[PDB]
Design a protein around this ligand. Structure first.
Ligand SMILES: *[C@H](O)[C@H](C[C@@H]1CCNC1=O)NC(=O)[C@H](CC1CC1)NC(=O)[C@@H](NC(=O)OCc1ccccc1)C(C)(C)C
Ligand SMILES: *[C@H](O)[C@H](C[C@@H]1CCNC1=O)NC(=O)[C@H](CC1CC1)NC(=O)[C@@H](NC(=O)OCc1ccccc1)C(C)(C)C
Lengths: 306, 306
C-alpha cells in the first residue's frame, strides 16, 4: 500500500553524465557511445545569450575549446556538430557504461524522471510531467543545463528531455534529445511566456483510481454522467477534454476497482463543483495530475527494471 | 527555481541489491563486501509469521537453503548469523560495486531516500520522512521487504532503513541496518498499532522558507510571537514542540531570507488558526512537513554527490 511520487532508479543515467566546459560556461553533457550531447548555448557567454547566432558562433570554435570531464578523466573531443538546439561532441572514447537507449519525444500529460546534475555530478532525482503548455515544473538552479529526463522500460533508457532554461514563472523549458524544443520556446534570453496551462484530466482520474486502490473512498458517489456532460464541466474548470481513448486507457484501472470510468468522472465533477471540504486524497488537499494511468498501474503492481 | 520532493541518485545502492530466496519466501538483500543483509523473516513461511521463534528456526537452516541471486549470478552462501531482526549471509564473493558506506540510525523528523525493489531489481526511488511515531508513509507491495532507505553525503552512503512490514493504516515499519526496529514494532504478524502521530514543526518552517526563496510570500505577516506562545498553538494543532535548537538550525534559512524564525512562527500560527483560504504554497494546499532544513538548503543551493 501507499502512493508516492516515484522516479525511476537513476543508476543507468548517472553513468552517462559528464561536465562540459567551454569558455566560462560550465554545464552537463550526456555521454552515449562516443558522443557527448549538451545544450548548444555552451558556446555562448553571458553577453551572447541575449540575442545569439549559433551557426556563426560554432564555426569559430575548435575541438580543444571543449573541456569534457568524465569523473576525473579527460575526454578528448575529436569532432563537433550542432543538431537543432543541442551540440554533439565527438569524443575518442566510447562510454563503457552506455546503457541500451532510445531518443523519444513525449506528449504533454506524460511523466518522466529528471536527474538533476551540477558540474557533471548528479544532485537528485524527481518525477514530473510535461505540462499541456509544454513547460515542466522542475527544480533547477544555475549550472543544471544539460540535465536529462528519461523513462526506463525493463533495461532500456528512453531519454526524452534535456534542460535548457527557466521562464519568468519559475517553470522550465527544454528540448528532446534531437535538440527540438518542447513548446514555442527558443534558447535566447528574450522575453518568453509559458502560455496558459490546463489540468491533465486523464491523470487526475488515474490518481483517483490509485486512491480507491489504497482505500480512500469518500469522494465516490452514486451518480453518473455522460462524456459530453463531463467535458462541459471540464472546460468550465480549465481541465483538458477527456476522449474515448482516455476512457479506454483507464479501462484496466476501472476493471481492478469495479468503478466505471464515467462513474469516476461523476465523482471528479462533484469534487470540482464542491471542493474537498477539508478532506484529503492520498495525502493531498488538491487534485493531483502528474500521475499517468501507467504510473498508477506500475506502482500498484510493482513493475521493476534493470 | 522550483521545489520538488527530491531523492538521492540511487546508482550506488542499485549495485548492492540482490535477491534472497529461502523456501517459498523471496525478498531483497543488501550486498556489501562479502555479506548480504536481509530481513530475518525470510526464514519464515506464511504460517510461521503469525508467532515465530527465529532462533529455533535458524539453527534448522543450512547455507545451501539460501539462494542469493546477484543479477543472474549465483552467490555461494558460506555462513550465516542473525543480528537482531536482520540476517547476515556470508558469501564467498565481495561485491565489487560496494560503495563507501556507514550504518546510521536516524531520528524522527529526518528524511531519506527509499529504493523500492522486487526480486532484487529496483522499481523506483522516492523520498520520505521518519514520522514522530516511527512509521514511514512509504509505497511498498508484497516482495518489497529488504528494500533500503539511505542518505548520501558526497561519496558515502549512509544506510538507515530496511523495510520489514506494513501496518493496518497503510504505513510501514522497519529496522536500522543493525536489525533494531524503529518504534515499538516486532517482526510478527500480530496486531500492532502505529500510535498517534504529530506534524514535524521544524520541517514545516523549513518548507515555508523554501516557499519564500521561491517567491510564495502571501502567508507572511507583520506579526510576531514568542517561542512559548507559539508552542501553545503548536500543541493545540498536534504539532511537535519547537526548541531553541530548531530555531538555531533554521538560522541560515532565516539569514538568507531576512525573516526571523519567530516571525515565521507567527505566520505558521496564522496558517494554523485560519487555513489557507484556497491559496497554495509551493503547489500544495497542505502544510508540508517531510522537508528538513538541510533538504531545503541542499535543493536551493545545489549540493551534489558522487
Ligand atoms: C543552464 O544551466 C541554465 C539553467 C537555468 C538557470 C536558472 N534555472 C535554470 O533552469 N539556463 C540558462 O541560464 C538559460 C540560458 C539561455 C537559454 C540560453 N537562461 C535562462 O534560463 C534565463 N531565462 C531566460 O532568459 O528566459 C526567460 C525570460 C528572459 C527574459 C525576459 C523574460 C523571460 C534566466 C534568466 C533564468 C537565466
Ligand atoms: C515483505 O516483502 C512484506 C512487505 C509488506 C507486504 C505488503 N506491504 C508491505 O510492506 N512484509 C510482510 O509480509 C510482513 C512480514 C511479517 C513481518 C514478518 N508482514 C506484513 O507486513 C503484514 N503486516 C502485519 O502482519 O502487521 C500488522 C498487523 C497484523 C495483524 C493484525 C493487525 C495488524 C501484512 C498483513 C501487511 C502482510
Amino acid at each position: 500500500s501507499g502512493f508516492r511520487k516515484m522516479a525511476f532508479p537513476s543508476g543507468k543515467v548517472e553513468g552517462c553524465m559528464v561536465q562540459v566546459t567551454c569558455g566560462t560556461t560550465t554545464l552537463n553533457g550526456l555521454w552515449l557511445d562516443d558522443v557527448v550531447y549538451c545544450p548548444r548555448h555552451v558556446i555562448c557567454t553571458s553577453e551572447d545569450m541575449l540575442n545569439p547566432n549559433y551557426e556563426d558562433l560554432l564555426i569559430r570554435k575548435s575541438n580543444h575549446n571543449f573541456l569534457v570531464q568524465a569523473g576525473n578523466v579527460q575526454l578528448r573531443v575529436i569532432g563537433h556538430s550542432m543538431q537543432n538546439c543541442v551540440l554533439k561532441l565527438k569524443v575518442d572514447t566510447a562510454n563503457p557504461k552506455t546503457p541500451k537507449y532510445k531518443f523519444v519525444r513525449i506528449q504533454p500529460g506524460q511523466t518522466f524522471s529528471v536527474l538533476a546534475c551540477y558540474n557533471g555530478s548528479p544532485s537528485g532525482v524527481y518525477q514530473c510531467a510535461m505540462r499541456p503548455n509544454f513547460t515542466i515544473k522542475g527544480s533547477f538552479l544555475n549550472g543544471s543545463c544539460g540535465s536529462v529526463g528519461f523513462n526506463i522500460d525493463y533495461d532500456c533508457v528512453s531519454f526524452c528531455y534535456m534542460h535548457h532554461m527557466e521562464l519568468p514563472t519559475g517553470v522550465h523549458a527544454g528540448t528532446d534529445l534531437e535538440g527540438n524544443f518542447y513548446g514555442p520556446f527558443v534558447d535566447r534570453q528574450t522575453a518568453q511566456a509559458a502560455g496558459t496551462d490546463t489540468t491533465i484530466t486523464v491523470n487526475v482520474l488515474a490518481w483517483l483510481y490509485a486512491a480507491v486502490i489504497n482505500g480512500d473512498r469518500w469522494f465516490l458517489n452514486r451518480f453518473t454522467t455522460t462524456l459530453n456532460d463531463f467535458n462541459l464541466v471540464a472546460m468550465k474548470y480549465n481541465y483538458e477534454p477527456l476522449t474515448q481513448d482516455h476512457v479506454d486507457i483507464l479501462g484496466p484501472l476501472s476493471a481492478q476497482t469495479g468503478i466505471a470510468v464515467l462513474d469516476m468522472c461523476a465523482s471528479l465533477k462533484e469534487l470540482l463543483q464542491n471542493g474537498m471540504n477539508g478532506r484529503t486524497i492520498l495525502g493531498s488537499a488538491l487534485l493531483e495530475d502528474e500521475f499517468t494511468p501507467f504510473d498508477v498501474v506500475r506502482q500498484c503492481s510493482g513493475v521493476t527494471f534493470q
